[PDB]
Amino acid sequence: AMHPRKDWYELTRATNWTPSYVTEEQLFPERMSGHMGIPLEKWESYDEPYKTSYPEYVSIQREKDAGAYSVKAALERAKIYENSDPGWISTLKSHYGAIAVGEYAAVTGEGRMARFSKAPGNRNMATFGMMDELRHGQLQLFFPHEYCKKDRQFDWAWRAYHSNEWAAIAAKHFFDDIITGRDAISVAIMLTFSFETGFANMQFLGLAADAAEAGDYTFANLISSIQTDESRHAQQGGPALQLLIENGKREEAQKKVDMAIWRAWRLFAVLTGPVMDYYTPLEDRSQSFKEFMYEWIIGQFERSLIDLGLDKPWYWDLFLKDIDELHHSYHMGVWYWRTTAWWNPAAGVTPEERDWLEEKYPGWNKRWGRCWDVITENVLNDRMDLVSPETLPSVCNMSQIPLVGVPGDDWNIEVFSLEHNGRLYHFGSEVDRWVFQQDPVQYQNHMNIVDRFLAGQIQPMTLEGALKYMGFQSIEEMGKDAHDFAWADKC
């Protein structure tokens, strides 16, 4: 006979002991561990609500992969690449490039916890977390790899994190800040409550709904399978947070989650927002970006934080206004500077799309519409030098994304600057400046790519010089309009 998990599970996590030949603080140094001075004994009540154990883990994960790979192999001649809208292809390119090697880095987040968490159940769940992120990294390299032979932009699935391309720097700044660059308990509450139970649902389940409408089941099936792992290992956050709160640290836990969520928001506004509202073809848009935000981030994720004992973030009203506005300008920034991207942005402003935009975002045409009017008239009149830029966008010193605002009839734009130790920093929001100020030492000597341009590190100091610096190896690699401007004809 077999004895049921509940009768032996406690012994799997009875692994704390009182060290003697080194001190507890040497064994669990606060810079790596983030225990905030809370003694071992207290950590022993950590109780992961989503359990697994080694025999079940390998069996079940074996079956998850059998399915992911068999669906891929069976659809490998469905013509997706060949019949898909090029805006859908671009969505694949930017997803894989922005995510795959970031997953592999997430292994180091889980490894940080596996070694340096004082909670024994966190250390074991983080060990499955390591395995999960390895899975996610290997899947998201394997799946785009067969498209290498079709298109050098698919090389960026592997290359992006190895480059200084500006969106990749925005990706690595966020992931190095929240995942690989902080102590174990910081990872436990910032990664699990910003990305894993938060913005990951947008990029891996929201986008899956669009993928399924577009008929790309290989992709939809892959990223929803990925997210089943995350729903398990993200449950390492709640008990860590509960211990922080019971031990008097609620204020510092609140601060960390507040910061991580804002940082995640700004990055996924640039990745996901343009995909959902512009690149995904109009017939395949399951919901607007903002509807998806209200479903996943406000309705589900933020509601869950409140249930666990946190307050709405202090920037709640700024955030809600940002959901209405920011990604429309990030999209415009990415598209106008498309040559700096490793994907081909779709403009997404045919009259039909603009009606949808107007409906999803009342007032859109008197704002971003004013800019697209001018852009569109230049394409129609063959003035193509005016749809390519000749300078660099100014860039946020926190998020590494261009500084943007509301264009058109009620123009409003604002940069939040800061002198600090002999240097002038610019930030794209009050919140981003505030993040910087919560932990200056984490950020203060970092140089964004425009800082680098102005300090002589990009040679030559031209746009083409910047493009080489960002890692592009050939003309085909740099982004272009997804439909080669054929949308103009419908305007």
Binding site: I60, A212, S304, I306
Partner: protein, 102 residues
């Protein structure tokens, strides 16, 4: 925002099931194992969001019955892509629930 406040002040809990053979059996299990609660379902094709107010139970026995083949609770993660609510799982059932009423 009125809209935001309304979106935030919900007490919806329950599984988000990815496209596959567990969608209909989880819907059916939700209705059977929560007699008297209204079950809501939003279908986004790649996944289905299944919810009730305050608490939602899925027992292993009912899920096995509606699925039509042997089933262990642990296997649910093959298809449980997300969930609303806190989670309490054991060998017989899983419970999605909120501690607070908003």
């Amino acid at each position: 925002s009125t809209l935001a406040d309304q979106a935030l002040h919900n007490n919806n809990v329950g599984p988000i099931i990815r496209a596959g053979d567990l969608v209909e059996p989880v819907i059916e299990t939700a209705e059977i194992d929560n007699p008297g609660k209204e079950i809501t379902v939003e279908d986004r094709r790649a996944y289905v969001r299944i919810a009730a107010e305050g608490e939602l139970i899925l027992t292993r026995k009912t899920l096995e019955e509606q699925l039509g083949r042997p089933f262990n609770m642990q296997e649910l993660e093959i298809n449980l892509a997300s969930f609303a609510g806190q989670i309490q799982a054991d060998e017989d059932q899983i419970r999605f629930y909120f501690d607070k009423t908003m």
